[PDB]
From a paper:
Harnessing the energy of ATP hydrolysis, ECF transporters are responsible for micronutrient uptake from the environment. ECF transporters are composed of four subunits, two cytoplasmic ATPases EcfA and EcfA', and two transmembrane proteins namely EcfS for substrate recognition and EcfT for energy coupling. The most striking divergence, setting ECF transporters apart from the canonical ABC importers, lies in the substrate-binding proteins; the former utilize integral membrane proteins (EcfSs) for substrate binding, while the latter employ periplasmic solute-binding proteins to capture substrate. Here we report the structure of the EcfS protein of a folate ECF transporter from Enterococcus faecalis-EfFolT in complex with its substrate folate.
There are six EfFolT molecules in one asymmetric unit. The overall structure of EfFolT is similar to the reported structures of EcfS proteins (RMSD of 1.5–3.3 Å) which consist of six transmembrane helices (SM1-6, transmembrane helices 1–6 of EcfS) that form a helix bundle. A pocket with the depth of 24 Å and volume of 1,230 Å3 is formed by the six transmembrane helices near the periplasmic side and is covered by the L1 loop from top. The folate molecule adopts an ‘L'-shaped conformation, with the pterin moiety forming the short arm and the aminobenzoate and glutamate moieties forming the long arm. The recognition of folate is mainly through the pterin and glutamate moieties by a number of residues protruding from SM1, L1 loop and SM3-6. Specifically, the pterin ring of folate forms π–π interactions with the parallel side chain of Phe80. The pterin N2 atom forms two hydrogen bonds with the side chains of Asp64 and Thr81, the N3 atom forms a hydrogen bond with the carboxyl oxygen of Asp64, and O4 atom forms two hydrogen bonds with the guanidine group of Arg26. Specifically, the O1 and O2 atoms of glutamate group form four hydrogen bonds with the side chains of residues Asn117, Thr121 and Arg142; and the OE1 and OE2 atoms form two hydrogen bonds with the side chains of Lys36 and Lys145. In EfFolT, the L1 loop covers on the substrate-binding pocket and adopts a ‘closed' conformation, while in LbFolT, the same loop flips away from the pocket and adopts an ‘open' conformation. In the folate-released or free state, the L1 loop adopts an ‘open' conformation to leave the pocket widely open as represented by the LbFolT structure; once folate binds into the pocket, residue Arg26 from the C terminal of SM1, and residue Lys36 from the L1 loop form three hydrogen bonds with folate, which we propose pulls the L1 loop from the ‘open' to the ‘closed' conformation as represented by the EfFolT structure.
Author numbering:
A (entry chain A): 7 to 163, 169 to 174
B (entry chain B): 6 to 165, 169 to 176
The structure:
Amino acid sequence: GTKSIALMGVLIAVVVVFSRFFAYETTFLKISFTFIPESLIGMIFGPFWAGIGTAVADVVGMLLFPKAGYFPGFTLNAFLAGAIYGYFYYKKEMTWQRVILATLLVTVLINIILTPLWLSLMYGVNLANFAWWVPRLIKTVIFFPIQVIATYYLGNKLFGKPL
Amino acid sequence: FGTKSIALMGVLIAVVVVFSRFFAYETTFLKISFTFIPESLIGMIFGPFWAGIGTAVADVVGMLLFPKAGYFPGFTLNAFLAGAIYGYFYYKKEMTWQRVILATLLVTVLINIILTPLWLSLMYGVNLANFAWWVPRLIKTVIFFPIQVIATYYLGNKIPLFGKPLSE
Ligand SMILES: Nc1nc(=O)c2nc(CNc3ccc(C(=O)N[C@@H](CCC(=O)O)C(=O)O)cc3)cnc2[nH]1
Ligand SMILES: Nc1nc(=O)c2nc(CNc3ccc(C(=O)N[C@@H](CCC(=O)O)C(=O)O)cc3)cnc2[nH]1
C-alpha cells in the first residue's frame, strides 16, 4: 500500500527528528520525546508494522547520525516500543488504565531492565555502582507522569491506512 | 513547653500508627504506606525537627504495639527522615507542584530506594541485586509516586485552615 507507505515515511522521519535534535543525549542517558510519534505509529499501524516502523526508524537514525556508535540491541528497543504501543493502543480507545499500563510496561521492561543492560553489555560497567542508577531512576520516575499525561492527551486530542 | 502540641501530636501519632498498621498493603520486602498523608501533615504543622522525632516515635509506639515483624533501627531512621523532609518542604512555605514533587522525590529516592532496601539487605539477608528482585519495588515506586504528589498537594490545598494556620 502506497498511502500507507507515505504515511510511514513521514512518521519514520519524525521519530528520527525527535531523536535527532531535541533530545538530552549524554553517554548513559537520553531524554527525548521519541514516545509520541511512536504511539501514533502504534495506533495507526498496529503491532508488527509499528514494530518494524520504529526499528528501521532507529537504523535510519544511526545511518544518518552515527557518531554515537551503533549497538544492535537499541534497535530491538525501538521495535518493542512499536509493538507495545501498537498492541496496547491499536486500537482500543485510550483509557487512563491503559495509557498507564502500556506506559508502565514500556518503562519497566525497556528502560530499567534492558537499556541498562545494553550499555552494561558493551560499555564497561560496574553494574554494582547503584549510584550509576540514580540519574536513571530520577528520570525513570519523573517522566512517567509526563509521558502519561502527554500520551493521554495525544490519544484524545479514523486513523489512516494502517495494517 | 508544649501544652497542646503534645495532645494533638499524640492524636497525630495515633493516626500514623493506624494508617501504618491497620490500613495499608503489605508483604515481606515491599510496602505502600498511606502514612505520607498524616506524616506530611506533621511536616506542615511542626516544622522539620519535631516532625522528624514525631514520626520516629510514631514508628516506635508503632512497634511497641504490633510486635511481630521484629524491630529494626534503620527503619526508624527512615521514619525520622520522612518526618524531617516533609517538615522542611511544607512548613511555612506554600505547597506548589514544583515542591511537592521535590520532597516526594527525595523521600522516594533517598529512603525508598537508597535506604529501605539496604535494611532489607541486612535483616532478611538478600544483599545482592536481582533483575528482577528489585522490580516489584520499582513498579511500586513508579506507579505510585504520582499518587503522592497528587495526594499531599491536595492535602496542601484542601476540602471542607478554617480556624488557624501553621500554628496549632
Ligand atoms: N542502534 C543504536 N541506535 C542509537 O540511537 C544509539 N544511540 C547511542 C547513544 N547513546 C545512548 C544514550 C542514552 C541511552 C538511553 O539512556 N536510553 C533510554 C531512553 C530514554 C528516553 O528516550 O526518554 C533508554 O531507556 O533506552 C541509550 C544510548 C548508542 N548506541 C545506539 N545504537
Ligand atoms: N524499626 C522498624 N520499623 C518498622 O516499621 C518495621 N516493620 C517491620 C515489618 N516488615 C516490613 C515489611 C516491609 C517493609 C518495607 O518494605 N517498607 C518500605 C516500603 C517500600 C518503600 O520504601 O517504598 C517503606 O517504605 O518503609 C518494612 C518492614 C519489621 N521491622 C520494623 N522495624
